[PDB]
Design a protein around this ligand. Structure first.
Ligand code: 97U
Ligand code: 97U
Ligand code: 97U
Ligand code: 97U
Ligand code: ZN
Ligand code: ZN
Ligand code: ZN
Ligand code: ZN
Ligand code: ZN
Ligand code: ZN
Ligand code: ZN
Lengths: 399, 399, 399, 142
């Protein structure tokens, strides 16, 4: 039973900073929020709920040797690196993350939940679902001999080309122990593929994926850069759109009418624009796509906010260095999004996206996920980079 | 910055021969066409844009040992021969070609674009899409043990039998690096198959191929000898028909209403009729089909021109010897097609077929692809066999 | 440059406790041992070099659900558990370990050497080399369908049946990144096999393994319970024997004449005798062998010491709980081995077994691996269970 | 068809498991399973009969000579650079098999022991000889 003393409380539900408060933590949950048992003093700190990152890849980090690494390294190495990546993510103030690809996160989540290793609460999508030659196709850009020995990927590998294959792929994701579904509706940037915005799913296939996932209680996140694929995914009924680089008035209207969530991922765009100027960092197939698309995400996100599109917090880490996820907040504030809305987008809006009601706000009956900042983030957003107190599920990880 | 001096300019857009002109070439493009910087003199030459051959097979050439060669030779040998074939094609005045089958042309195109080898600009279809036992089926006429070992070809090998397989085949062609799609709608002549004009695709499969290709920005060329398969392909919405031996009034009406392009390929027909009389040149299964169909192409092409069917230039080289592609012009003129129309069918009509607007005519902003002939081709068509100046993308390959 | 102050120094080379001393640590190595720069005080602690455990299995730990776990869990889970196992091992005072089986340790060693995770210095044998149906055969006790699917294990899987297969197996271990070689000369206890002491290698196969390993600079450790297999392995020229339950006067004479090292592993025997009485902990095939064999190790080790056989320190952890490796010391002292010899068997004798001369003794030029104990271990051996200071390669991990 | 010099082509190289010329060195586990362990037809040999079959397969593939890697290298994804990777009884088999088909053998060797083995077996040329010493020089001269 630990009583936390906070000089200033941030109300995620409303978006205002209250006065001094005392939280009572018992059984890993918040019991009382009485204004004003071991005592923890945070008198000179602003108390805020734990943050959520709705777009990470904890089983990888981008490097100059990234592409040559896909044939030399085994998943055990990726797990050994993901241990440190998860610790870095947890220490930065992010008590929960949504992982959007990779077959090590379902195992990292199991390890963290058992107490073997330290890290945030993971909601893992698992393997991605794509079509032939798609953005998430595992055998893109392989020579002929390797492509014959592996064989054509099928629904069990994530690659589908019909309604029945899509149904089997969702069922195989459920069998493999996933918490949600992730599809690539259009092309990408960092893949060894020629296109970056071509429509790669049919409406009748995305509809099948959504219908199959609805039976197993899953939500679907769609990766889309181009207009046509993004429109198809929004019309089929996905839960969130991942980059939306070429969004236009029509697609904004459809998203507003449907209630789809938007995850801008400023950090990935800034990173790829900065690294596209260097020579040898990217392949020659990737550099043009990276230079062309990574520079238009900030304008689209600002326009989406000004048009009334619901925006949640995601960084696409794995591109950027794990543990520097909060720099995204400052980017959002620089793009014109208010600091209070940027803080709400990681606490309550993220919980709405995840479909869980036990986290997000410091209220009785919820999980005890509390962080504390040295300075006030509403006046100076840079204060998000100075975290001094981190508590997850009633356990103090950083004092 | 090279200024080209021409005594007579051929206007592809209109079809008339103008007077003396001066072309200004800079940055690989044409800037000015001022009538009248290094100077190139072609005062005694008729100036004309570069030619396009819309039907070639640069990976092969027909020979008396052609059929026995499919089990002994590797694609590396075919590439080593395609080097010389491409140089011969470029020197004959053809600065662009459309390749309609093979898995060496996508590599040859990449090599040419990088400057490793010399040749024309290639638009490569890649592997062909057929049905089981079709004209482009890779395992036609194989013994039982070999067919057991290789296995039944699937959508990844080009052989499809349903809508979903057709969709996967188009996606696999996109993944393999193709620029367009080629299907065999009926039977052929040079394949180890019993039929020559039977319908081998259903309308619901060609429609799927066309719909899938439209998403990836591809155009579809259809090989058809018989009436029913050709009618199905025209109704499904293909871009061009390849031989059309048994075309009839109805099919002509449908092609005129739809805007489908026609590629007669006189040279292949003449070659197969001449070589069908010899003994041992063709297999016993092929000789009857070759003798029966190769003799009807010239009568159909003349009727198609007289009925108002749009005709583009193609020779089906690989059957004939690479480098003698211009003889087709004389054949066309002998069939009754005017010389001016025969010259236009290789410059502007070919560009319309290819779907590119940067080539075809010597106008500002277009690519600098220029050839020069010793004599006038409008009075004597044989002058197409004497090319003295060849420039491709602002680079002089033949002076 | 950290100077460590010690009240009492233990001389591993001689086996006596000296007086107060001051160690100078720079660059990860020991520079000066001047009797008597940041200062570390350990005035009330007996200083001793870091310990080495010559027999561990860091990729696993025995549990009531151990046998049913070999078909449900993936190596990623084993790595996530090995992280904590390695940290526990390092904190107990063991700065180096020799791993004798499992394909996660070569990855764990790479991760530790890169600084990603904390743990001791690992010398990993990798996959074990056995014969058909042997103790280390991966497919022992599988039903017919599974054995059909996997296929008969070959030299690449560790299972050999001839001289050339043994040579290929050693070469494949070198290719996979191993530091030594481990073979199973006889049967075991914890395997799903009928025998526990039958000879499973021929002399001509062990000789081939030793000869192949000598080229790649490898040392060979042999697992042997029975007399005949142990005699064969000693005669072939292996470096160490792992359990030696049924050793007899002749085999002792051969080991003394050859210089083979002996690793008794008291802890595994005690553990299996205690757990064999329980019902459901072991399979019905394992319980008789465990009850029969695990009760004889202590009498053989005492006789071996009294006969003059060189004995090194090893516990066979993975059977016992990781992190309780020093209780073996007390067992040795209870068996009649002197405390000073038991302490030497983990510092200098272990380094002699490993074939490295940079560790073992606190002398100039050696690695700075230092631990400190609260009490004197020569008078009370129980003081080995109270470690207060742990420094590995000049870095302090426990103060 | 193309212009160039007169080529005498050795073809695929003959190595042992995990050797310098091993085609699957430094591949992850899934790729190594799908390709399978290289055999004598792929150039990787581990016995006398495999070496004989490898020379015969080189002859069948249209080679003009034989090339083996006696020791480790530099540019390969392998840990060693001078370890002995062939036994004398395997190099002798390669040389004896090649002598029937009228082939000459060139040996790649950096380290002393592998180079000595290759010289003693009867190869025609040594390729780098970085760690050659007086003894090996005497053997090569003789
Ligand atoms: C395992 C994981 C798989 C994966 C998948 Cl499935 C998708 C992405 C992805 O959406 N990447 C983006 C990165 C990016 C680049 C620019 C602007 C926004 C985002 C892309 O290339 O378009 C992606 O980045 C990754 C990734 O980093 O690895
Ligand atoms: C690689 C390439 C594949 C290929 C394909 Cl897919 C189709 C043809 C083809 O349409 N050949 C025609 C040749 C021909 C014969 C007579 C009249 C017109 C054309 C045929 O046999 O009907 C064809 O000729 C070829 C060919 O020559 O090799
Ligand atoms: C991965 C690793 C593989 C392995 C191998 Cl290869 C050998 C042993 C082993 O020697 N076990 C001993 C345990 C034991 C039991 C009683 C007395 C001494 C030792 C045995 O069953 O005879 C062994 O215990 C293990 C093991 O625990 O898992
Ligand atoms: C296809 C061909 C295969 C091949 C083979 Cl089998 C051997 C070598 C080779 O001997 N490389 C040398 C390069 C080298 C490096 C330093 C000093 C001398 C030579 C080595 O890595 O030791 C070698 O370089 C190559 C090569 O470059 O590719
Ligand atoms: Zn994405
Ligand atoms: Zn992503
Ligand atoms: Zn055709
Ligand atoms: Zn053709
Ligand atoms: Zn053992
Ligand atoms: Zn063991
Ligand atoms: Zn070499």
């Amino acid at each position: 039973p630990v009583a936390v003393q906070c000089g200033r409380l941030f109300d995620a539900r409303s978006g205002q900073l209250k006065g001094p408060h005392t939280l009572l933590v018992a059984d890993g949950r918040i019991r009382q929020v009485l204004p004003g048992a071991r005592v923890v003093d945070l008198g000179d700190k602003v108390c805020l709920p734990g943050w959520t990152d709705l777009h990470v890849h904890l089983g990888e980090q981008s490097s100059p040797q990234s592409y040559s690494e896909d044939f030399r390294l085994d998943p055990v190495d990726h797990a050994f690196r993901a241990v440190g990546y998860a610790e870095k993510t947890l220490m930065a103030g992010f008590t929960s993350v949504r992982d959007l690809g990779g077959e090590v996160s379902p195992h990292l989540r199991d390890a963290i939940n058992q107490g073997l290793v330290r890290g945030p609460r993971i909601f893992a999508a698992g393997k991605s679902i794509a079509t032939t030659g798609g953005h998430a196709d595992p055998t893109n850009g392989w020579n002929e001999r390797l492509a014959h020995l592996v064989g054509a990927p099928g629904p069990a590998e994530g690659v589908v080309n019909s309604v029945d294959e899509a149904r089997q792929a969702v069922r195989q994701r459920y069998k493999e122990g996933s918490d949600l579904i992730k599809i690539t509706a259009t092309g990408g940037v960092l893949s060894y593929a020629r296109s970056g915005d071509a429509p790669q799913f049919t409406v009748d296939e995305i509809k099948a994926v959504v219908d199959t996932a609805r039976d197993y209680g899953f939500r679907v996140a769609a990766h889309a850069h181009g207009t046509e694929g993004m429109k198809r995914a929004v019309q089929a009924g996905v839960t969130s759109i991942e980059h939306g680089t070429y969004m236009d008035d029509e697609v904004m209207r459809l998203m507003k009418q449907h209630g789809t969530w938007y995850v801008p991922t400023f950090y990935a765009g800034r990173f790829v624009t900065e690294k596209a100027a260097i020579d040898g960092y990217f392949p020659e197939v990737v550099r043009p796509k990276a230079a062309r698309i990574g520079a238009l995400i900030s304008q689209t996100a600002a326009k989406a906010y000004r048009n009334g599109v619901r925006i949640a917090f995601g960084t696409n880490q794995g591109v950027g260095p794990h543990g520097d996820n909060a720099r995204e907040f400052v980017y959002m504030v620089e793009a014109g999004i208010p600091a209070a809305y940027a803080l709400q987008a990681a606490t309550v809006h993220a919980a709405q996206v995840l479909g869980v009601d036990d986290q997000g706000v410091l209220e009785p009956g919820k999980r005890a996920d509390v962080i504390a900042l040295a300075g006030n983030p509403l006046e100076d957003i840079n204060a998000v980079l100075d975290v001094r107190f981190v508590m997850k599920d009633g356990v103090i990880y950083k004092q």
